[PDB]
Amino acid sequence: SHSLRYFVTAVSRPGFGEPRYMEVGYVDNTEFVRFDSDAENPRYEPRARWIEQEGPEYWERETRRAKGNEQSFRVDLRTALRYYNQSAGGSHTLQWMAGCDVESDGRLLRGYWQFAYDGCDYIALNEDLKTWTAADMAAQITRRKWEQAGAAERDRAYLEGECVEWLRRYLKNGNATLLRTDPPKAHVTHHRRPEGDVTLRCWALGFYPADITLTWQLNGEELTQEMELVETRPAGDGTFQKWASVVVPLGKEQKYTCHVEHEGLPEPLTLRW
């Protein structure tokens, strides 16, 4: 399956004028468009080569949407101060994620339309694309308003319609990069510690998409609490990397296994030093 997702952030900065407003769009794990109100001449901008195909009308339309959006977030930030009885002197954040998970045959798997204030869940459109989950009493005020206004209906329409249709167009136009499956190249490194034991590090490199699991086992037991596991990270060439490590006794390396799961791996990898 694939996803089209927009990540939106409005952050207030009292004394330095208007809140900064940003949108960033992704197809799967590939950044393709961006808006930043702090740019010289704020406009929607291309972030992947394949979107540069779109004509001026696309960029103008998307810039307009961003600018209308920006205005609502300015209002929302002010309303939030009232809902939470907060001073007007401090910086606050409103986040906004909306998008669609879609099977390759065009079927919608899941639509998202959800918000967070100062880093915590605020309100989210449920899977039914009809009702809202409100995280606190402030969000319940919003819920009642959006229920009254029938807000979910037009949101649902976007998620089932435009979001799906444009995702399909993007996947077609950018297929040479977007439709890739690059399996992880994996290996284990061995590092003797001054303490007289060993760090084993299981590496996964050059994979796409980014979704992956990397786990260490001993005697069939996953070493969840023991391992150090870094966030999956972009290599900056359209692929990703990740590693997981455990500390083990010298001479017992061979008992430990690293397990790698990825869509590019019909059978997961098991690696043993």
């Binding site: 998307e62 977030f73 939030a80």
Partner: peptide, 10 residues
């Protein structure tokens, strides 16, 4: 194409 708030505020 991205999502619109449509001036429906919190």
């Amino acid at each position: 194409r991205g999502p619109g708030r449509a001036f429906v505020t919190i």
